[PDB]
Design a protein around this ligand. Structure first.
Ligand SMILES: Cc1cc2c3c(c1C)C(C)(C)C[C@H]1C[C@@H](C)[C@]4(C(=O)NC(=O)N=C4N2C[C@H](O)[C@H](O)[C@H](O)COP(=O)(O)O)N31
Ligand SMILES: Cc1cc2c3c(c1C)C(C)(C)C[C@H]1C[C@@H](C)[C@]4(C(=O)NC(=O)N=C4N2C[C@H](O)[C@H](O)[C@H](O)COP(=O)(O)O)N31
Ligand SMILES: [K+]
Ligand SMILES: [K+]
Ligand SMILES: [K+]
Ligand SMILES: [K+]
Ligand SMILES: [Mn+2]
Ligand SMILES: [Mn+2]
Lengths: 500, 500
């Protein structure tokens, strides 16, 4: 099975890439696995595969940390993400985001039901498992629970059966047969949960599949449109219908090669203590527990020698940055284009803790619009900040054609030198805010509203007659023949490889 | 003579450090020298010494590029700056800034007059030189002139003789015996020029000394207080009285070991075309010429085999960042402390193009003040933005004790995650602005006023009861014994030197 379509094959691909460290000696899921993983993410090291996890019983479970984090070399920096998508390991961010957007103007390819798969190799009923007895990790020392769910896919369906959503949302073990987790607006798991609650008849049939096809976990992390079933979007992107098997205890379908599947229900009435958790912006607020959604687990099914992927998230760089940020940026780029805004590229700078998105403007198009900064700022912020795709993003930075938004150094240069504080910005206080950013949920203002800004780093002539500067850099401040001479004589004179 | 007290010894020190590349083949001062230097600055390579400059005649002149730029290794990153000050090459930024501030509560050590020095080894009178015949560099392709003066020290004295100012301000060749340059408020060369213009009697006696003692060029770049003679401040900092020789044609005094000295006058009535120039924020606006101050040169004196230092300034990283930014930050730190504000450290992040200063707050002190963000923001901005030391700085970022302001990654993390846009900021529109920032002088608003902001990245509890988070990082999210275990087993498990 191809690496993008089968987690187990993905792990083999990382090994073959020399991007995997197999640790076969005992590792404690209480902090140790996650501390190793954290150190890997902070240093862009190889992904750790913990094959000897203290507390693993009857096949549950090995852990793979850092599945979507960065490689050390610049040439294959995003290779782990490329391996989720059948792309070359040297793929650029633009090529990864284009791949993730490609299914947006293709017919869906619905999934294929198959009678069985590797996820059915083992099962545990209601009398045979205890979630508190599994080697679920404690990921950060002050976490409010053991976060089983950091890289699996929740599967829920609208009451009318017409939309089946796949998404990532955190969850922790509550007791032997329940989880608690985040289910918050405007997320699709929340939107679907609301539909079931308004019907008022039953709890939401649910499954959570870990170690799903890598292309599916990528779509699970992306804010594709309301009402779009992720399975058909992944089918179109990959050009292949995904193979799904029915759950044993409900009529939901899970990827045939899922490593581990939990089947049960998401309550429309019950809650339980959830959090705190060491989160994407780099913080944990110890003791900040709140009531979260409550899931009941009725059945576990799993592969022989099952592997649980884990995100040890926090400070740069992990899956919450590489996937949340970048995939929101990709959808925002599309959204802008669909609203007739002249945006060519979008990325969420890592340096912003993925709270900014830099939007590259086609300034020839902009000049034809005969508009102004104030007008344009307002139009861009109204489009993005009133849409779900803008949820996580609190600052939009508009930049001209000379800036590569995928290079944080260039975005910071443009921001710092072309956007006059206050005058060149529009604040948005009557939009939904992302409460997990510390300045929102633990800040001075409403946790769920406002705190957003569009910062215009377009210069005045970019709206009128064209760029009227050249950079004071080696590239722009010297003619071609001189530059080349300098480069050709560099080592000869006495001054100091691409892959590495 | 010690390296901090003699430019020629400083060049030898860079050689001995293996931080110098001597280029003994012909190099063109038209762009080539500056392109090499630019490439060095963008890659933190060794300083270039051009010993064979096309057009050099009768000893005028060799060029040293990148005298105050960065080294590649982290361990001696600031070694070229340390060599200006007799510090170890591994000195931290805090240690360099502390050294530059040390004379602020010491009695000045006035300079010593000596009858002669190496700067008197050669002379050229009014009939013997032509500035257009010297190998003055063209530094950027669109510059409006050949910028002779990028790393020399202008020397002017108040009419009453009580204050002698040393400072760096750019100047270019106008014709055979004149320069034009920037002389703008609130700079001390401007303040002194205004005193002479109000007297109305004569042009300002002036000298410009290139290749001055390195400790003197550092003070020349620092906004030490109005009315303080830099020579006595440098004396106190170094613990030694500087040796000066009188000019031949006026009664100003220049460092005895200056490589090259121009003597003449700064006009109180005449102006000439000046600029454009590839400037510190990374831009040049071709054709943006304006009338600047006009200097007449009456005499040149110089050392045998004179060396002209040059800054090929622009995009990161050069003397305009390492010296302008950092030395303004140092003075702002002091200014804050003198105004009873609880600031421990200040630095201008390179990532901000040195337009921000991050101010580290002693939050124990802050809590005792029983104040609020709004109150505190306003007080800090009124102190700094109404003072000359804040001139170049458009954004102040207040950060708590956990942030190392000398680490741009940590400043950006704090800014991005702890400062709510708008609510946690105070804009300042009625303060002097720095027109050279593109968003000021080429922006949408008044070039010389406003555009400043204080961004408070202190969290709410930092004002009241104390920090209420831990970082979700390896350092903070795992206990000490575990961290150490992980570090000790890192290479054994299969994962990947200080100097490099
Ligand atoms: C890649 C990734 C994406 C995450 C999360 C994580 C990782 C690794 C972990 C679990 C580590 C941390 C948490 C923290 C949190 C941010 C959250 C979450 O708990 N709640 C949430 O609502 N959104 C999350 N997302 C983003 C989410 O997947 C996207 O917003 C996606 O568009 C949702 O799919 P729908 O569009 O179909 O609604 N988590
Ligand atoms: C280290 C350095 C410092 C510079 C400049 C440069 C370098 C290398 C160059 C020449 C390359 C570029 C220009 C551009 C420009 C910024 C300027 C200038 O032309 N005008 C100005 O007014 N201030 C400049 N400074 C800063 C100045 O030295 C400090 O502000 C100092 O406090 C002044 O001394 P006083 O306090 O005693 O007034 N230049
Ligand atoms: K999704
Ligand atoms: K702007
Ligand atoms: K000075
Ligand atoms: K704040
Ligand atoms: Mn969805
Ligand atoms: Mn001064």
């Amino acid at each position: 099975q191809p690496a993008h379509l089968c987690f187990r094959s993905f792990v083999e691909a990382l090994k073959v890439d020399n991007d995997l460290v197999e640790i076969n000696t005992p590792i404690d899921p209480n902090l140790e696995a996650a501390a190793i993983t954290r150190r890997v993410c902070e240093t862009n090291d190889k992904a750790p595969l913990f094959n000897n996890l203290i507390g693993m019983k009857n096949g549950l479970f090995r852990i793979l940390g850092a599945p979507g984090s960065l490689r050390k070399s610049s040439a294959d920096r995003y290779g782990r993400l490329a391996r989720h998508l059948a792309l070359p390991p040297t793929a650029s961010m633009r090529e990864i985001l284009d791949k993730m957007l490609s299914a947006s103007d293709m017919p869906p390819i619905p999934p294929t039901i198959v009678p069985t798969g590797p996820c059915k190799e083992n099962s545990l009923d209601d009398s045979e498992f205890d979630l508190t007895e599994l080697p679920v990790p404690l990921i950060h020392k002050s976490d409010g629970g053991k976060y089983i769910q950091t890289y699996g896919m929740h599967i829920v369906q609208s009451p009318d059966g017409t939309w089946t959503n796949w998404s990532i949302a955190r969850a922790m073990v509550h007791d032997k047969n329940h989880l608690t987790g985040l289910v918050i607006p405007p997320q699709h798991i929340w939107q679907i949960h609301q539909m079931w609650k308004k019907e008022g008849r039953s709890d939401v049939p649910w499954a959570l599949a870990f170690g799903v096809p890598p292309a599916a976990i990528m779509a699970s992390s992306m804010p594709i449109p309301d009402g779009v079933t992720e399975a058909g979007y992944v089918g179109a992107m990959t050009g292949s219908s995904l193979e799904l098997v029915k759950c044993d205890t409900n009529d939901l379908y899970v990827p045939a090669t899922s490593e581990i599947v939990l089947e049960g229900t998401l309550s429309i009435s019950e809650t339980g203590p959830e959090g705190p958790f060491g989160e994407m912006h780099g913080y944990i607020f110890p003791g900040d527990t709140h009531l979260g959604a409550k899931y009941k687990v009725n059945r576990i099914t799993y592969r022989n020698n099952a592997i649980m992927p884990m995100s040890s998230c926090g400070r740069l760089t992990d899956e919450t940055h590489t996937m949340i940020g970048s995939l929101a940026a990709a959808e925002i780029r599309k959204l802008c284009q669909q609203n007739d805004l002249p945006i060519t590229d979008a990325f969420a700078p890592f340096e912003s803790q993925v709270t900014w998105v830099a939007l590259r403007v086609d300034t020839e198009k902009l000049r034809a619009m005969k508009t102004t900064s104030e007008g344009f700022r307002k139009r861009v912020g109204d489009v993005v900040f009133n849409h779900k795709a803008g949820y996580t993003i609190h600052r939009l930075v508009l930049v001209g054609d000379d800036i590569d938004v995928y290079e944080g150094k260039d975005v910071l240069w443009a921001f710092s030198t072309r956007c006059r504080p206050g005058m060149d910005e529009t604040l948005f206080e009557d939009v939904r805010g992302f409460p997990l950013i510390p300045y929102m949920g633990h800040g001075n203002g409403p946790a769920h509203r406002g705190g957003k800004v569009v910062s215009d780093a377009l210069m005045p002539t970019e709206y009128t007659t064209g760029r009227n500067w050249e950079a004071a850099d080696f590239n722009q401040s010297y003619p071609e023949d001189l530059k080349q001479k300098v480069l050709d004589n560099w080592t000869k004179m006495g001054f100091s490889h691409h892959h590495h």
